Amino acid sequence: KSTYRTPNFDDVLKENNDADKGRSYAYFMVGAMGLLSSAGAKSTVETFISSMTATADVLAMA
Amino acid sequence: WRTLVGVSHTNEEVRNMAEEFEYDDEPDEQGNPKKRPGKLSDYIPGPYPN
Ligand SMILES: CCCCCCCCCCCCCC(=O)O[C@H](COC(=O)CCCCCCCCCCC)COP(=O)(O)O
């Protein structure tokens, strides 16, 4: 068999590749994952930093 | 006392419950001990001293 014959890939290929929209769906999901994890990173940092503020008993004697 | 406000009782209610108990104050101008009523930053007292 010759090396110039490409094997069968028709199980996995698209409607038409349509590069306008093969890039659309992959990058909406990569953008959503970066949006949620940047919000989660903020909430984590602000939870740890606020623990260093004056406690309830110190504010009661304020 | 303060942790009951907003959970089971009103602020005005808890201030009146605490004032029914006496707490050790700091000594007077000559070093003799004093007493005072309770405030919100105090802790709920127990029946026995030891
Ligand atoms: C070294 C710290 C990392 C610990 C991770 C352990 C995972 C167990 C659950 C997390 C408990 C903390 C909850 C919290 O802080 O408040 C919660 C944060 O909620 C979240 O978004 C979950 C955070 C999950 C992490 C997201 C991935 C990237 C994080 C970046 C790390 C720098 C509550 O939010 P809030 O403070 O109420 O606005």
Side-chain angles (χ1 to χ4, degrees):
Chain A
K1 185 176 193 229
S2 181
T3 51
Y4 293 95
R5 304 293 302 230
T6 312
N8 208 8
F9 283 113
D10 281 355
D11 290 81
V12 297
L13 284 171
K14 193 179 288 289
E15 169 169 280
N16 48 347
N17 304 307
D18 210 34
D20 32 81
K21 189 229 112 291
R23 292 178 272 152
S24 230
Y25 207 55
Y27 299 157
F28 163 79
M29 301 296 248
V30 167
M33 204 156 81
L35 187 139
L36 288 183
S37 72
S38 291
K42 175 212 164 173
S43 296
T44 307
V45 170
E46 286 180 348
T47 290
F48 279 104
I49 290 298
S50 59
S51 73
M52 290 172 73
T53 47
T55 54
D57 60 356
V58 169
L59 292 167
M61 311 311 298
Chain B
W1 289 118
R2 57 177 158 75
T3 68
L4 295 176
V5 178
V7 170
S8 50
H9 296 90
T10 306
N11 175 255
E12 192 259 4
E13 292 179 319
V14 176
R15 291 180 82 93
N16 285 329
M17 294 200 293
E19 282 168 358
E20 288 171 274
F21 298 93
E22 295 295 301
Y23 288 77
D24 274 10
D25 205 346
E26 65 184 2
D28 64 342
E29 184 64 25
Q30 290 280 358
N32 305 288
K34 293 191 288 179
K35 293 287 196 65
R36 56 165 186 81
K39 51 179 65 161
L40 281 177
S41 54
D42 288 329
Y43 285 81
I44 291 169
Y48 305 117
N50 52 55

